[PDB]
Design an enzyme around this catalytic site. Structure first.
Site, mmCIF file in Angstrom:
data_model
loop_
_atom_site.group_PDB
_atom_site.id
_atom_site.type_symbol
_atom_site.label_atom_id
_atom_site.label_comp_id
_atom_site.label_asym_id
_atom_site.label_seq_id
_atom_site.Cartn_x
_atom_site.Cartn_y
_atom_site.Cartn_z
ATOM 1 C CE1 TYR B 54 43.106 -2.941 -0.802
ATOM 2 C CE2 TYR B 54 42.422 -3.731 -2.956
ATOM 3 C CZ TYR B 54 42.127 -3.430 -1.642
ATOM 4 O OH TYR B 54 40.850 -3.619 -1.164
ATOM 5 C CD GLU B 56 45.715 -3.458 2.547
ATOM 6 O OE1 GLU B 56 44.631 -3.451 3.167
ATOM 7 O OE2 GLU B 56 46.310 -4.508 2.228
ATOM 8 C CG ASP B 208 37.387 19.364 12.107
ATOM 9 O OD1 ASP B 208 36.145 19.339 12.177
ATOM 10 O OD2 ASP B 208 38.022 18.976 11.104
ATOM 11 C CB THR B 234 37.432 18.584 4.640
ATOM 12 O OG1 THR B 234 36.812 18.468 5.930
ATOM 13 C CG2 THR B 234 36.776 17.604 3.696
ATOM 14 C CE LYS B 237 34.100 20.661 5.621
ATOM 15 N NZ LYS B 237 33.458 19.445 5.057
ATOM 16 N NE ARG B 243 32.283 14.966 -0.473
ATOM 17 C CZ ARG B 243 31.247 15.799 -0.480
ATOM 18 N NH1 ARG B 243 30.703 16.198 -1.619
ATOM 19 N NH2 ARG B 243 30.749 16.226 0.666
HETATM 20 N N1 LIG Z 1 45.116 -12.996 5.096
HETATM 21 C C1 LIG Z 1 45.341 -11.565 4.984
HETATM 22 N N2 LIG Z 1 46.357 -11.056 4.061
HETATM 23 C C2 LIG Z 1 46.592 -9.596 3.943
HETATM 24 C C3 LIG Z 1 47.474 -8.830 3.166
HETATM 25 C C4 LIG Z 1 47.226 -7.504 3.498
HETATM 26 N N3 LIG Z 1 46.265 -7.461 4.404
HETATM 27 C C5 LIG Z 1 45.752 -6.227 4.982
HETATM 28 C C6 LIG Z 1 46.866 -5.470 5.712
HETATM 29 C C7 LIG Z 1 47.421 -6.226 6.925
HETATM 30 C C8 LIG Z 1 48.672 -5.552 7.494
HETATM 31 C C9 LIG Z 1 49.212 -6.210 8.773
HETATM 32 C C10 LIG Z 1 49.398 -7.584 8.836
HETATM 33 C C11 LIG Z 1 49.890 -8.168 9.997
HETATM 34 C C12 LIG Z 1 50.202 -7.379 11.093
HETATM 35 C C13 LIG Z 1 50.748 -8.008 12.381
HETATM 36 O O1 LIG Z 1 50.666 -7.416 13.405
HETATM 37 N N4 LIG Z 1 51.361 -9.329 12.349
HETATM 38 C C14 LIG Z 1 51.882 -9.929 13.570
HETATM 39 C C15 LIG Z 1 52.276 -11.382 13.298
HETATM 40 C C16 LIG Z 1 51.259 -12.106 12.416
HETATM 41 C C17 LIG Z 1 51.461 -13.622 12.431
HETATM 42 O O2 LIG Z 1 51.275 -14.244 11.439
HETATM 43 N N5 LIG Z 1 51.875 -14.272 13.667
HETATM 44 C C18 LIG Z 1 52.090 -15.711 13.778
HETATM 45 C C19 LIG Z 1 50.749 -16.440 13.675
HETATM 46 C C20 LIG Z 1 50.659 -17.656 14.594
HETATM 47 C C21 LIG Z 1 51.590 -18.790 14.169
HETATM 48 O O3 LIG Z 1 51.231 -19.590 13.266
HETATM 49 O O4 LIG Z 1 52.713 -18.924 14.720
HETATM 50 C C22 LIG Z 1 53.109 -16.198 12.745
HETATM 51 O O5 LIG Z 1 52.718 -16.663 11.642
HETATM 52 O O6 LIG Z 1 54.340 -16.144 13.003
HETATM 53 C C23 LIG Z 1 53.068 -9.114 14.085
HETATM 54 O O7 LIG Z 1 53.949 -8.708 13.282
HETATM 55 O O8 LIG Z 1 53.162 -8.846 15.312
HETATM 56 C C24 LIG Z 1 50.019 -6.008 11.031
HETATM 57 F F1 LIG Z 1 50.327 -5.232 12.112
HETATM 58 C C25 LIG Z 1 49.526 -5.424 9.872
HETATM 59 C C26 LIG Z 1 45.856 -8.701 4.703
HETATM 60 C C27 LIG Z 1 44.790 -9.230 5.670
HETATM 61 O O9 LIG Z 1 44.147 -8.487 6.331
HETATM 62 N N6 LIG Z 1 44.562 -10.642 5.782
HETATM 63 C C1 LIG Z 2 33.872 20.917 10.714
HETATM 64 C C2 LIG Z 2 33.734 19.619 9.962
HETATM 65 N N1 LIG Z 2 34.658 18.640 10.105
HETATM 66 C C3 LIG Z 2 34.606 17.460 9.471
HETATM 67 C C4 LIG Z 2 33.580 17.134 8.589
HETATM 68 C C5 LIG Z 2 33.579 15.781 7.916
HETATM 69 O O1 LIG Z 2 33.714 15.877 6.501
HETATM 70 P P1 LIG Z 2 33.228 14.637 5.596
HETATM 71 O O2 LIG Z 2 31.724 14.791 5.561
HETATM 72 O O3 LIG Z 2 33.911 14.850 4.265
HETATM 73 O O4 LIG Z 2 33.715 13.422 6.351
HETATM 74 C C6 LIG Z 2 32.498 18.122 8.343
HETATM 75 C C7 LIG Z 2 31.349 17.841 7.406
HETATM 76 N N2 LIG Z 2 30.782 19.103 6.975
HETATM 77 C C8 LIG Z 2 29.352 19.210 6.771
HETATM 78 C C9 LIG Z 2 28.948 20.618 6.405
HETATM 79 O O5 LIG Z 2 29.429 21.568 7.062
HETATM 80 O O6 LIG Z 2 28.142 20.778 5.462
HETATM 81 C C10 LIG Z 2 32.582 19.414 9.056
HETATM 82 O O7 LIG Z 2 31.637 20.380 8.890
HETATM 83 C C1 LIG Z 3 37.628 -9.274 3.482
HETATM 84 C C2 LIG Z 3 38.229 -7.931 3.156
HETATM 85 N N1 LIG Z 3 37.663 -6.787 3.616
HETATM 86 C C3 LIG Z 3 38.163 -5.564 3.353
HETATM 87 C C4 LIG Z 3 39.312 -5.377 2.582
HETATM 88 C C5 LIG Z 3 39.880 -4.012 2.282
HETATM 89 O O1 LIG Z 3 39.003 -2.963 2.668
HETATM 90 P P1 LIG Z 3 39.317 -1.503 2.071
HETATM 91 O O2 LIG Z 3 38.630 -1.505 0.728
HETATM 92 O O3 LIG Z 3 38.719 -0.554 3.084
HETATM 93 O O4 LIG Z 3 40.828 -1.479 1.991
HETATM 94 C C6 LIG Z 3 40.020 -6.547 2.026
HETATM 95 C C7 LIG Z 3 41.261 -6.369 1.187
HETATM 96 N N2 LIG Z 3 42.450 -6.551 1.993
HETATM 97 C C8 LIG Z 3 43.750 -6.514 1.351
HETATM 98 C C9 LIG Z 3 43.975 -7.684 0.417
HETATM 99 O O5 LIG Z 3 43.192 -8.660 0.451
HETATM 100 O O6 LIG Z 3 44.953 -7.636 -0.359
HETATM 101 C C10 LIG Z 3 39.456 -7.877 2.323
HETATM 102 O O7 LIG Z 3 40.040 -9.012 1.855
#
Ligand SMILES: Nc1nc2ccn(CCCCc3ccc(C(=O)N[C@@H](CCC(=O)N[C@@H](CCC(=O)O)C(=O)O)C(=O)O)c(F)c3)c2c(=O)[nH]1
Ligand SMILES: Cc1ncc(COP(=O)(O)O)c(CNCC(=O)O)c1O
Ligand SMILES: Cc1ncc(COP(=O)(O)O)c(CNCC(=O)O)c1O
Ligand SMILES: Nc1nc2ccn(CCCCc3ccc(C(=O)N[C@@H](CCC(=O)N[C@@H](CCC(=O)O)C(=O)O)C(=O)O)c(F)c3)c2c(=O)[nH]1
Ligand SMILES: Cc1ncc(COP(=O)(O)O)c(CNCC(=O)O)c1O
Ligand SMILES: Cc1ncc(COP(=O)(O)O)c(CNCC(=O)O)c1O
Lengths: 454, 454, 454, 454
Positions: B54, B56, B208, B234, B237, B243
Site C-alpha cells: 500500500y 498511497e 487521449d 493507455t 494498446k 492495463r
Molecule cells: N481512518 C483513515 N486512515 C487512513 C490512512 C490512509 N488513508 C487513506 C489515505 C488518506 C490520505 C489523506 C488523509 C488526510 C488528508 C487531510 O486533508 N487531512 C486534513 C486534517 C485531518 C484531521 O484530522 N483534522 C483534524 C480533525 C478534527 C479534530 O479533531 O481537531 C485534526 O485531527 O487535527 C488536512 O491536512 O488538512 C488528506 F488530504 C489525505 C486513510 C483513510 O482514508 N481513513
Molecule cells: C481512446 C480510448 N481512450 C481510453 C480508453 C479507456 O481504456 P480502459 O478501457 O483501459 O480504461 C479506451 C478504451 N478502448 C476500447 C477499444 O477501443 O476497444 C479508448 O478506446
Molecule cells: C473502507 C475502505 N475503502 C477503500 C479503501 C482503499 O481502496 P483502494 O483499494 O481503491 O485503495 C480502504 C483502504 N484505505 C487505506 C488503509 O486503510 O490503509 C478502506 O479502508
C-alpha cells in the site's frame, strides 16, 4: 524479439528493484492493517495472458467477441463471491469489475444517487475512508465530496465508538439518500442493525463498506453486514488476501416491489465509469475467493482476531492506551499521547527498523501533522503463520522502538529536526541498527506467501 | 497451507480455464485495434509481490512508511515514460498511478474542471470512446456526461471528422477543454489545429493517445507533446504493457509586461490521489515500466514501423478486392470497412471461426443495433511478428468468412436468425469448422509473446 | 381614447372588486403579522408615472437614458434607508431594487454563494421562511433548496426558542457558507451575537432577514441585527408600512482587507436576477422610509410591542398557551391544543367573522394539515390607532370565536366536515353572524391609513 | 398622524421629484421600444389598498384567510388574460403572479428543467435579453446561465437570425427548451419552425412575447399560442399596463395505441409559489387586469394597428433619407439603425435634447463599449396618439441631433471627449438647447395617458 524473454534478462534494473521489495517484505514486520500477502496461485493468475483480453460489458452482454472462456471466469468469480459470503444467487448479485475499492464506492453513488445528492459517512480522522465523503475545513479533497454533498458523523470521544445517537439526529436534519457503514480505522464491530434503522427512517440506502473486515465476514467469525445492509462494497486485497480489485454486492429479486439495484450498479461500473475490465485481476480474485470458502481460511481469520487481541492485551500491560478500550477485529488503535510520544515520530522510528505501521489521529487531537496514535494490523503477519506469542514479541519490539523515539524527542524539537536526528546521531543510529537486525532476523524465519523469488 | 502452492495444484479449475484463454489467443488471429499480447517480462512484474504494498501518496510525500522500494519503482516509471516520448523532465511530468485509461481521463476532468463544466470530444458513433463525453440523447451514459456537460463533435463525405464544424460549435458552446483522441478512426488529427481552436475559446487541449500510443513513442507518427497541454493514454494498446493509464501533463513556465508558471501538475496529481482513487497498483506500475523500457529500444520502433505498413497492407489488400476504407487510407493501425453488403452480421461468423473484431458505425448509418463497419487491428498480430504477406493472407481468410456471411445475409431473417441457423443447421457448420480449422492451423504457427502455459 | 379616464368609469367591474376589498380591510380585524396598512402618500407614489420608466442599472451606471431624476429617487431611497436604520454611508450600502422579500434573499445567495453551496436557516414549521432553505421529507419545494443545498436548524421544544447550541453543533458538521438569522413566526429576539460567533467559527456569512421586525429595528425599540450581521435583508410592507419591495443592506469599505459585498450583491440583483426596476415601488419605499425616521414611527413601533404584549397577557388569563412563554416583539404564537381546538378550525372560524389570522404549527405537532396554533400580529391594527385596551377586546372576540369552533368540533368529525357545518347549520350560522356584526362594528370605528375610497 | 395625508403635504420632496418625472415624460418624446405610458385607470389599481393584502397561494388553495376579494381579482385577471389572446380556458391556463418579466421566465426554467439543464436562446448582442441565457464568455452574467447551462444562438448577412444554424447547434447541444423571443429585433419569428426544431431535439417551445405582447393580443401579428407550449410576457410593453409578468401555459390533453394529458400547469404554478417568490403583488395583478380589459376593446386594436404603420413610417422615413434598417423592414414596433457613421455616441446628444433611446449591437460590430445602432420605439408615443406624419416629424427631429453628432464625432477624441465638450463648451450648448426647445414644444402638445400631476 519475441516477448517471451525473462524479466531478469530483459530488464535487470527492474528485476533488481522488484527483488529488493520482496526481501523488505520478508525481513519486515508489516503491521499495516490494510496490507496482506497474496498467495502464489492468485499472483500468477494476476500476471497472466488475461491481461490481453478486452471484455467490455458483462458475460453474455458483451459488445465485442473473443470472450468465450473469459465470460466463464467472471461467472466463476461471481459464483464464489456469493459462495464465500453465503448468499443466495436469487437474493444477491455481485459485480466483480471494480478496479479497486475506491472505484467500487464511486460506482455505488453514481448508480443510486444524482450529482450533488447527500452522502453520510464516518469522518476520516475518526476512522472513515476518503471515498466515504471527506472534506477539510479548507476545500473538498475527495471526489465523493465534489460530485456529491457529503456530511460526516463522528465518534463518541468518551467511548471511542461510533455515535449512533448523533448519527440519528444528524441524518434527520441532513436527510441523506445514502449512509456508508464502513471503516478504515475502527477496532470494533459496527452496529449494522442500528444503521439500518436510521436509514429506513430518513429513507436512505445503507451501504456497508466491508473492506477491512470482509475476510472476517467470509469466515463468519464476526457479524456479517449482509444481514442488514442491501449494498455491500469491499476490497479484495486486505483480509481477503487476493489481488487489488473491488466487489459490489447488491440485493436482487423482489423487495411485487422489485429490487432495482442489479441494473443500475452494473451500468455505473460500465459503461459509465470504467472501461476494459482487468480480467487478470478478476481471475485472481476468484482464486482468492475459493480460498476463502476453505476451512483453512476460517482458521486463518480466527487467528487474525486472537492475534490482534493478543497484541492488544500485550500493549495494555506495557502501559499503552487503546481508544475504544481494546479490539474486536483485526486492527488495534494505539493511543501514544499518554506516554509522551506521537504517531508521527513513532511511525518514522518503527519504519527505520522495518516495522511498517501508519499514523492515526485519536479522538481529541488537534494537530493533523502530529497525530498521537498508530493503527497496527494483524492479518499481514498472521498470514505468515504468526501466532499469539509471536505478536507478543512484535509489541516488545514496538516498545523498545517507542522507548528510543522517547529519548530522541528529548534531544530534538520540531518534527523536521526529529527525522534528521535519527540518521545523523551515530549513537542513536547504532541503537536503531541493533533492533533492525533483531527485527529482521525474527521476521525472516517465518514463511511468506507468494513466489519465493519475486 | 502456506500460500506458495502453484495455481495448477491449488485451483485445478482456474488453471484449465486460463489455459483455454492462452489457447484461444494462440488458436486465433486477434485483430481488435485495442488488443495486444504483452511480454513475459512485464507480466512477471504484474504478478509480483508489489500487489501487496500500500503506497498511497507520491514519491517524497507518502502517508505511510516502508515505501523505499516502490518510491524508486515509481520514479523509474516516470523517467521511463518521459524518455519513451522524448520529453524534457523540466518541461513535462507524468503520473503513473491511474488504474486504466478511463480513470486517467476522469482524473484530468476533475483536476482542471469544476463539476458540470463544459468539455467537447468526438462522438462515440463517430469514432470516439465513452470517456470523451458520450450521452445517448435519451440517457447520460458515461460519467463524463453526468458530472460534466459535454457536447459531441462529429463530416460524413470526407470520411474525416468535421474539423471546423467543431470550430463552429466551439464558441457557441464555449468549452474549457476539447479532447483530441480517437477510439475508431483511421486518419491522423491536426494537433496544431486542435490547439489554436482551443486557444480562441480559452480551452485546454487534451490528447487521449490511447490507440496511437505506440506510433508516437517510436517517433513514426507525429506527437502532440508540443501542441497539446495534457496527454492521457493507455499502457495497453500498441505499447504492449499491462492495463493501466498515464497522464502526461505540462510542467514549468513569460509575462514580459508587468513570470507565468504552469498550473497543471499540482492539480492532476491531487485528482488521482486523494480525490478519485486510493492505493496505487504497484504491480501495474512496475509492469508498464518494463514495457516503457522496451519502448525506448529499436526493437520496438521497427515493431511500430511494421504496424503502419501492416495496416497499410491490410487496407490495400482489402482495397484491391472491393472494399472501401472509411478514410481513403490509414496511417494508424486499424482499418474501417463499409460492410456494399452489415457490421453486426460479420462478428458472429468470425468469432465462431476464431477471428475476433468489433462493430464500427460508418458515417451514414441510420442504425446502431446492426451497424455497417468492422474495425480490425494490426498491433495484436504484428507483435506476433506478422508482416506484409502474412497480413495479406489474413485479409484472404476473412474473405471466405465474409463471403459465406453474404450468403447467410441473403437468407435467414433479421440479425436474430443469422446467429440462429449458424449453431443449429447441420450444413452451415461445415464451412464454419473448415475455415476455423485452417485459421487455427495458420495462427498456431506464429510465435506468441508472454508465457507458454498461461 | 386618451388613457386619462377614471377607473370607476373605464372599468366599473374592477373598481367594484377593488372597492369591496377596502371595506373588508376596514371592517375586518387583520391579525396577520406580516400585513400592515400602507399610507396614502406612499400608495399614490406606487401607482404613479414612475411605472413608465425603464431604469435598468444603477444611478450613474445606467445602460439607457431618461433616468435624469429617476436616479435621484433611488439615491434618495438609499440615503433614507441607511438613515432609517442609523448606518454610516461609508460602512453600509443598500440595494433598493429587489422586487420583494423573496427575490431579495435569492440575490444574496447568488451574489455570495456558488450553486449547490450550503445554506442554514430556521426550519419552516419552527418559524423560518421559505426563502431560508426549506425541504419537506418528500421533495424540495423552495428554490433556495434547489439551487443551493440547505439544512435547517430547529427550536428547543422545551423553551420554544432557537437551539443555538444545536446550531453550533450542526454548523460544525454541515460546514455552511451562509447562515440565515431571520424569522417569520417567532415571538422573541434572535441572539444575533451568538449567531455571529457560530458563523465566524465555520467561516460563514451571517445573513439577517429583518423582514418581520425591521420597523422595530428602525425605531430602535429592539436590538438591531446590523450590529452583528454583515448582510441584512428585509421586506418593506410589514412593520415598515410601505409598498411591497425589498432591501439588501451590506457592509462597505474596509474589513487593508476590503469588504467585497457591494459589487457582487448589486450584480446579483441586476443583471443576474431582475431586470427593470419597479421605480414606482422604490419611491414608495422612500416615502415610507422617511416616515420611519420620524418620532411618530418610534411611538408607533413602541405601541406595537405593548399591543402584542397586551394581547399576549390577555390570552394567558383566558387560559391560552403561548410557545416560548410570551412575546418580545410584534406577534404572539397561540398554542391551541391544550384547549381542544386546532389552528385549522380556528383560522376558518375567525375568518368567517373577518378576524383574519393564520394557522401555525407548534413544537411537537405531527399533523401538517391540522396545526395546533395560530400566529397573531399587532402592527396591522396598531396602525389603525389601536391601543392596549382595544387589543384586549380583540382577544375577547377571539375567545368567543374559539368557543364556537369548540362546540362545532363536537358535532363534526373531519376537517372537511367542519368547514361544511359552519355554513349549513343555521343555528351556528346565526351565532357566527352575531360576532361578525359585533366585530365589524368595532373595527369600522377606527381610522384606516391610505385612501378613503380605494 | 393617520396615514391619509397627501404626498404633497407629507413628503414635499418626493412630490416635486416625481412631478419632474411626469414633466420629463411630457417634455420629451420617449422612443424605447420597451417603454410605455400606462393608463390612469390601471395605476389607480396599482396604488390600491391591495398592496396591503398577503395572498400567498392560488384561487382555491391559499394558506391564509380573508382572501375573498383578491381571489376573484386573480380569477378575473386570468380570464381577462386568456380572452385578450383568444385562448380556450380548457386548453390554456395563466398564472398572473410573476413580479416582472425576468422572474416570469426564471419560473418557467425552474418548473420544466432541473438545475444545470440545457436551454437555448438568441444572444443579447444579437437582439436578445439577459433572461434567455447570456454569458459574457469571461463571466456568467444572468442567473439563467448560472443555474442552467445555456448555449447562445445567433446570420449577419440576411439581417435576420440564423434560423438553421440554431438547428445546426440544436442536436449537438441537445437542449430541453429553446426560447423564441426578442428584445431588439425588427422581424417576426417563424413560430412553426421553432416548434418542429424543438420536437426533433425533444425540447419545449418557450415564446417570450415581452415586446410583441400588444401586437399579438390585437390579432394583427401572428400568435405563438398554437405552435408554442409555454408563453411568458411582460404587462409593460405594448400592453400599456403595470410592470409585472404573465406565464401562458398549455393545459389539457391522445395515445391511440395502448390518453395523454399536459403536465405544465401544476409545475409552473408550483415554481412561482412556493419556490421562487412569496406574496403576490395584488395591486399589480389588479392593475394589469385593467389593461387586459382595455386590450380586448377595439380602441386597443386600432391603437396596435397604428403602432405597426407608425414603425413602418418610422423606418421608411429613415430609409428615404440615408439609413439602413437592420432587417429590410419591420412589422414589430421598433427600428434598427446602422449609425455609415456610432451607437453610444447618439444617446448622449439625444437625452440632452429630451429624446431617449438605447444602444443596439448591429450584426458585424467588433465592439461593445461603442456599438453601432440605435433602437427607437413606437408604442410609447403611439399611446400619445402619434400617427404617420407625427412620427415622420420625429425622424426629422433626430436628424438634426444625429447631424450635429456626426460633427462632434469628427472632433473630440474617443467616446470620453464626446460627452465631455457637450456639457462644457459654450458654443456646443447652443444647438443643444435649441433642438431641445423645439423638441419640448412639439412634445408637450400631445396628450399624455395617466394622471395630470403624477
Ligand atoms: N481512518 C483513515 N486512515 C487512513 C490512512 C490512509 N488513508 C487513506 C489515505 C488518506 C490520505 C489523506 C488523509 C488526510 C488528508 C487531510 O486533508 N487531512 C486534513 C486534517 C485531518 C484531521 O484530522 N483534522 C483534524 C480533525 C478534527 C479534530 O479533531 O481537531 C485534526 O485531527 O487535527 C488536512 O491536512 O488538512 C488528506 F488530504 C489525505 C486513510 C483513510 O482514508 N481513513
Ligand atoms: C481512446 C480510448 N481512450 C481510453 C480508453 C479507456 O481504456 P480502459 O478501457 O483501459 O480504461 C479506451 C478504451 N478502448 C476500447 C477499444 O477501443 O476497444 C479508448 O478506446
Ligand atoms: C473502507 C475502505 N475503502 C477503500 C479503501 C482503499 O481502496 P483502494 O483499494 O481503491 O485503495 C480502504 C483502504 N484505505 C487505506 C488503509 O486503510 O490503509 C478502506 O479502508
Ligand atoms: N413560520 C412560517 N409561517 C408561514 C406562513 C406563510 N408562510 C409562507 C408560505 C408557506 C407556504 C407553505 C408552507 C408549508 C409547505 C409544506 O410543504 N409543508 C409540509 C409539512 C410542514 C410541516 O410542518 N411538517 C411537520 C414538521 C416536523 C414535525 O414537527 O413533525 C409537521 O409539523 O407535521 C408538507 O405539507 O408536506 C408548503 F409547501 C408551502 C410562512 C413561512 O414561510 N414560515
Ligand atoms: C423572513 C421573511 N422573508 C420574506 C417574506 C415574504 O417575502 P415576499 O415579500 O417576497 O413575499 C416573509 C413573509 N412571509 C409570510 C408571512 O410571514 O406571513 C418573511 O417572514
Ligand atoms: C424580451 C424580454 N423579456 C423579458 C424582459 C424582462 O422584463 P422586466 O425587466 O420587467 O423583468 C425584458 C426586459 N426588457 C428590456 C428592454 O427591452 O428594454 C425583455 O426585453
Amino acid at each position: 524479439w519475441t516477448g517471451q524473454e525473462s524479466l531478469s534478462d530483459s530488464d535487470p534494473e527492474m528485476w533488481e528493484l522488484l527483488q529488493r521489495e520482496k526481501d523488505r517484505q520478508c525481513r519486515g514486520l508489516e503491521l499495516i492493517a490494510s496490507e496482506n500477502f497474496c498467495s502464489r496461485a492468485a499472483l500468477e493468475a494476476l500476471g497472466s495472458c488475461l491481461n490481453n483480453k478486452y471484455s467490455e460489458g458483462y458475460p453474455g452482454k458483451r459488445y465485442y467477441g473473443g470472450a468465450e472462456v473469459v465470460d466463464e471466469i467472471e461467472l466463476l468469480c461471481q459464483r464464489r463471491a456469493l459462495e464465500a459470503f453465503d448468499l443466495d444467487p436469487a437474493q444477491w448479485g455481485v459485480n466483480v469489475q471494480p478496479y479497486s475499492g475506491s472505484p467500487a464506492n464511486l460506482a455505488v453513488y453514481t448508480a443510486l444517487l444524482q450529482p450533488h445528492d447527500r452522502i453520510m459517512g464516518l469522518d476520516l480522522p475518526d476512522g472513515g475512508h476518503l471515498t466515504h465523503g471527506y472534506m477539510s475545513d479548507v476545500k473538498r479533497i475527495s471526489a465523493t465530496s465534489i460530485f456529491f454533498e457529503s456530511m460526516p458523523y463522528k465518534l463518541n470521544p468518551k467511548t471511542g465508538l461510533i455515535d449512533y445517537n448523533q448519527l440519528a439526529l444528524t441524518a434527520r436534519l441532513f436527510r441523506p439518500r445514502l449512509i456508508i457503514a464502513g471503516t478504515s480505522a475502527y477496532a470494533r464491530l459496527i452496529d449494522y442493525a442500528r444503521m439500518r434503522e436510521v436509514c429506513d427512517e430518513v429513507k436512505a440506502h445503507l451501504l456497508a463498506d466491508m473492506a477491512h473486515i470482509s475476510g472476517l465476514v467470509a469466515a463468519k467469525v464476526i457479524p456479517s453486514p449482509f444481514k442488514h445492509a442491501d449494498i455491500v462494497t469491499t476490497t479484495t486485497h486486505k483480509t481477503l488476501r487476493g489481488a487489488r480489485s473491488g466487489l459490489i454486492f447488491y440485493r436482487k429479486g423482489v423487495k411485487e416491489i422489485p429490487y432495482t439495484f442489479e441494473d443500475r450498479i452494473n451500468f455505473a461500473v460500465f459503461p459509465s465509469l470504467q472501461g476494459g475490465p482487468h480480467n487478470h485481476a478478476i481471475a485472481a480474485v476468484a482464486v482468492a475467493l475459493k480460498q476463502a470458502c476453505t476451512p483453512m481460511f476460517r482458521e486463518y481469520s480466527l487467528q487474525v482476531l486472537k492475534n490482534a487481541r493478543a497484541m492488544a492485551d500485550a500493549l495494555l500491560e506495557r502501559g499503552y492506551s487503546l481508544v475504544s478500550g481494546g479490539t474486536d477485529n483485526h486492527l488495534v488503535l494505539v493511543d501514544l499521547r499518554p506516554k509522551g510520544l506521537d504517531g508521527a515520530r513513532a511511525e518514522r522510528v518503527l519504519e527505520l527498523v522495518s516495522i511498517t505501521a501508519n499514523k492515526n489521529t485519536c479522538p481529541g487531537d488537534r494537530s493533523t501533522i502530529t497525530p498521537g496514535g498508530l493503527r497496527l494490523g494483524a492479518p499481514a503477519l498472521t498470514s505468515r503463520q504468526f501466532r499469539e506469542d509471536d505478536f507478543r514479541r512484535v509489541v516488545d519490539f514496538i516498545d523498545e522502538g517507542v522507548n528510543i523515539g522517547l529519548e530522541v524527542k528529548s534531544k530534538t524539537a520540531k518534527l523536521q529536526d526529529f527525522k534528521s536526528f535519527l540518521l545523523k546521531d551515530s549513537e542513536t543510529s547504532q541503537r536503531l541498527a541493533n533492533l533492525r537486525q533483531r527485527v529482521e532476523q525474527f521476521a525472516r524465519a517465518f514463511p511468506m506467501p507468494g513466489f519465493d523469488e519475486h
